[PDB]
Write a structure and sequence with these properties.
Chain lengths: ~400, ~400, ~400, ~400
């Protein structure tokens, strides 16, 4: 332990503010005031806080109410020093968004949702946020005949490109990040994985300022490898923000503390974020944001314990991942396994497709049966990682 | 029933040729000769046959052996009239490909794999194939430390762009299709879903001739909605080929007959392929290829029954999907649910982002509580589809 | 297809009464007066209604209020003729039940939970129910060290045996039905599948009146085969009740209309309920109960439409499943496949183990390679089922 | 951490002997002489070895060959000191077993399968095994109409009761352990989870000597909690053997090294095996058996390295899990959380149902809102476990 603001640990107001209402029961904790959240998070070592528009401003609030609320919010920020690196919009709670915001079958709900996003971009800019996150939780269906699937993507593009053009038009220093989720609350959510979100961005007019906001638990709900998924976002220059938490299996979104889900996977996620790639390449330098929910069985001391635990987990794994990579036994194990060898291009500088085909050395006279004998020693290399993770080495 | 060549039903040689060896047991049927496969498939109504290089030419074969084999193959094609619309390479059976072809940690295996693909492009062109499919089944890992994840994607890009540049250089009338699979045989396979494959293509130098080959069962192994997934491929102008089969759940790749997995989902897949989108848009016009495996408990009469059953299933659902959409009760149900309304743009012709924000009608004075009362009637609309599917209407 | 009370369709009050609140948003529908639920279900063809103590009687109800409400609900039943075949207790909604009722860590809470069940058994007895369902939704944990697992099963045993002991003591004509669910709301729920439910029942002092209430979607939440799980329950004579609905994959509990999830699986469930086993055996004769939730996107015509969709789906599957088994072609296929040879004992009349090992024909000179030649033809048999399901036969 | 025979590590011959053939490719390693397996495992610290009849003795072995092979294998055991605690039968590899052994549709095949098991029980008895495992891998179906499900369970019962009856008849000191697997190679396997395994055992004439052999990966294949499933088996006193390995999600059976799958889950499995239940109860004392497969990418140093990784992982988890429970801080946390109050009966000494309902303190005047205020602090307790696991405490 000991997180400091330099670690860039950010928390959403809704994480610690999560009161416990689930599908089978009512809240188990008292509402948390947002000024209280800020003082408490700053006491713990956080660098910043994120929020959804309705986390701070009730759906109902009048302009006078809005201003009362923002002034205390801003004072708190001032008194503590926390930044506001990311802002997001609630397009899922109110009954109006029951069929989605941007891809609602109703045109007038679509306009209302886009209106709400546009206004929220103005608050984002005013707050000093660098990222605007979009989670399309109600965009999807339970039944396959509910939507025209091409029209749904057209409507998604229209929303995102209007938002994007508005940033560009106003000159805000903001990027858009899409947050994928496979299901829940909808049976099928559109752009369900990091893959679908990356692909979708390439069809946009204003894709240059649109990237992703992957969430550990969300890719694990489709049973995918989260390190692989973030690696491809990174590789594409699209890992703009990240949500860290835990998920044990393919079930409802659990949003456990980071490291309380798939531990081995969390260790390799930390190694990619902190250390980057073994042969060198891109590095993710944004905030380490925790999108989790404090277990409903626990009271407020559990809330603050859980906020701490997210930061401890990440620093404990960071430590073990630094020792792991620095270990000369591991570096040699890596070399034997061909980790560095993957880094060499397949073709020689200047060789063409017809030049290699025609190279007798790599095809006609290649000894495939000899080449197959190679002991990659991937088990041994996995054993060294686990032993570094167990604090054994 | 009655399929004819005009239906464009294509089968891989390995489907009907699947002898039954699984991870827990030996083959239960005798090898099937490829000339026999062609006569039998042509008798049934198929339009074409696809194959992997090693399905026809043993890994070991000499040029004299290659030519003996191709001449009988080509004669059979000639005598029956079946086309060869797609060809693919085996980069997974031989022990040399145990760490992958293109993303093998060993550089010399990478060159061998690319050599093998290049040579197979020449046979593809000679056969009259329009599509060259790439399934990267051994590209991936069991453990997260096994690979440098950026280097793996670099190596994947280098392979695919060399292949692509070679087509372009030679002027073959061929496109590349990537076939996604989440896992098996590898713990984690790279580009595991339609999403990841679409995204990956956008990072290529020669992406203009690279598209996808989605497989029903493969997206269902990540628990995804296959109709949604193909809809996004289509929408992107990237649905170049398709593999149809069945899968009951998230488990090993089952490759059941099409319609013997998720039936409701198969019905909507057929509706998108045959009918396209309710508001109009792109249409998939390629071959309807069945990538399935005849159950190992069944003998050869089951093989030919199973080939028939794939075509019957697709024609039975086609029929029900045509009746469903033609039904005036359904068209009215669709209209009530806003299916057509999704097709209208959100913004009015000429309206800007600042023009709608500022439109009092869609934000400040919008009645969200009134708008939330809308009965979308999605259940009723799903009930009409199921009733058309049950042959009830 | 029109349901009559003869059909035995029963609906939970909480099903049509579902308000639409989920984890990400508020209710989309006004609360349903129970009196109105009764009258409405009676006009649709329902046979009876089921409820949870708190669905009718609020947690904090005074005795004058409790009397009133019961007066109103008995009146409605008397007017309409609806029966009340099953009653159940809410041990999940109040914040007190955050760690469970029966298996809470706090002893005072376990006593309050058992007391709440005992009172509810009186009520069940007063309404004329035959079945008392226990759904242990809060029984389990998010974390592995949270519970003493042997002690959680003793605590579950204590509560269920006390309830069972009380039933017998009072002379009520009531059986207890346990209802498995693998996860949600807890990360792991105890007795997660039909198998675990059955196994626990065998360790009970009063297991003779304790059986199962399997739910379609719940077994599909662990990827199991619903038809196989209720077949084990039938076979053990412990299928006391059933909850019919749809689930589209391993994800949050969807509670879709019966037949709106896995369609083929629904078809074979209905065949099992209607036709029983091919070679004879126990048959289920209780209520066909629907535990579903009207999608929150739908408004009140949608609620009664969804109610009605359940009974339509069941009657359509039933029509097809009777047709399927009555078909000569199907019977012939069944014969070929060995469905009726499975029913023949393996041993001969008074043949012992020793007798069989010594029989040379069965082992020593058994021709294993000739016996492996059988064409089981299970694919053709599956094709016949689907053709009956699709009403093409 | 160095294993000694005192540790009781047992390995299947088929584990280190796995050749690397999977569904998509051929073997990557030469066959392993069993004599050599024995000697090698003996030098690593193995306590004993287990095998399948056909792992040692080929299907078609003549009697002179069978004698030889057994002579060779008994010699190796005598030289090394290795015990043979469990023996099992291959009822899945020959094409004859394509529809199962015990539950095949063909009666001649069921008789041959039972005969094959009876002979194998003699052999088990001759090798000194305490346990006889039955893995019904081919028992199940791909399609729902393939089997008469009540008849499949009677057929399973018949075979298992005959085997059990024969054991008792011969006076062998042998218990039968059933091993669940939910799917693969069949689409649905009968008795798919620990729960179903336990439930079936209660319908057996000779259930007293019939218990379970749960496998880590198999329960994780249905998304269940391995620790909860073996806790139910322990509690019912039916945990006769166990198979330890790793699984990374709901997918094909991976058989990774123990600890190379779900790490936290492994940690809590080891705590259950070593520490038993927090409030006391049955303890498992059999062999710690590893049913894994050396990844096919690895060559022979990798095979012995993987063997050794199993025992290292187990010893490292064991060191941490003993430390964890010995920690005062952990004990305090456990107290707070109610882990020890779960062990207190709910009822008082001679308190009846009637007594509790009438007790006003437990119901009528129970303060539910005050009792809901308890901070169970399960998150802090989970954090302590992980900190012990990571060796940071
Ligand atoms: O704004 C992004 C938030 S929205 C919503 O609270 C959700 O459940 C989260 O997973 C996303 O991170
Ligand atoms: O070439 C594409 C083939 S390769 C391999 O036979 C595989 O299992 C399939 O799913 C793919 O469709
Ligand atoms: O007690 C029966 C009910 S309790 C609760 O409403 C639950 O979610 C259901 O699945 C059960 O069937
Ligand atoms: O009989 C024990 C073996 S049989 C077979 O090898 C299987 O795949 C395993 O999981 C079991 O543990
Ligand atoms: Mn989440
Ligand atoms: Mn998130
Ligand atoms: Mn497949
Ligand atoms: Mn395929
Ligand atoms: Mn449910
Ligand atoms: Mn239910
Ligand atoms: Mn296994
Ligand atoms: Mn096993």
């Amino acid at each position: 332990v000991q997180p400091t603001p330099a670690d860039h640990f950010t928390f959403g107001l809704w994480t610690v503010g999560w009161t416990g209402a689930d599908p089978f029961g009512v809240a188990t904790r008292k509402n948390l005031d947002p000024v209280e959240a800020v003082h408490k998070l700053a006491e713990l070592g956080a660098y910043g806080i994120t929020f959804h528009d309705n986390d701070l401003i009730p759906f109902d609030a009048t302009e006078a109410e809005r201003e009362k609320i923002l002034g205390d919010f801003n004072q708190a920020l001032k008194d503590t020093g926390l930044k506001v690196p990311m802002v997001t919009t609630n397009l899922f709670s109110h009954p109006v968004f029951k069929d989605g915001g941007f891809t609602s079958n109703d045109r007038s709900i679509r306009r209302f949702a886009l209106a709400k996003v546009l206004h929220n971009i103005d608050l984002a800019a005013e707050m000093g946020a660098e990222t605007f996150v979009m989670w399309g939780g109600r965009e999807g269906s339970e039944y396959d005949g509910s939507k025209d699937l091409a029209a749904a993507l057209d409507r998604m593009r229209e929303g995102v490109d209007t938002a994007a053009g508005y940033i560009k038009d106003k000159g805000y220093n903001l990027r858009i990040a899409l947050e994928p989720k496979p299901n829940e609350p909808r049976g099928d959510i559109f752009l369900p994985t990091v893959g679908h979100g990356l692909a979708f961005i390439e069809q946009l007019e204003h894709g240059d300022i649109v990237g992703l906001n992957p969430e550990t638990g969300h890719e694990q709900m489709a049973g995918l490898n989260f390190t692989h998924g973030i690696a491809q976002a990174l590789w594409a220059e699209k890992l703009f923000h990240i949500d860290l938490n835990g998920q044990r299996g393919i079930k409802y979104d659990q949003d456990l503390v980071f490291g309380h889900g798939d531990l081995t996977s969390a260790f390799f996620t930390v190694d990619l974020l902190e250390n980057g790639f073994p042969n060198g390449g891109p590095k993710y330098t944004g905030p380490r944001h925790f999108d989790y929910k404090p277990s409903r069985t626990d009271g407020y001391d559990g809330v603050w314990d859980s906020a701490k635990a997210n930061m401890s987990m990440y620093l404990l794994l960071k430590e073990r991942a630094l020792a792991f990579r620095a270990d000369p036994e591991v570096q040699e194990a890596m070399k034997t396994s061909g980790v560095f060898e993957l880094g060499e291009t397949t073709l020689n500088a200047g060789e063409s497709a017809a030049d290699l085909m025609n190279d007798s050395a790599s095809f006609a006279g290649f000894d495939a049966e000899a080449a197959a004998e190679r002991n990659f020693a991937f088990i041994r290399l996995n054993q060294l990682a686990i032993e570094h993770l167990l604090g054994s080495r």
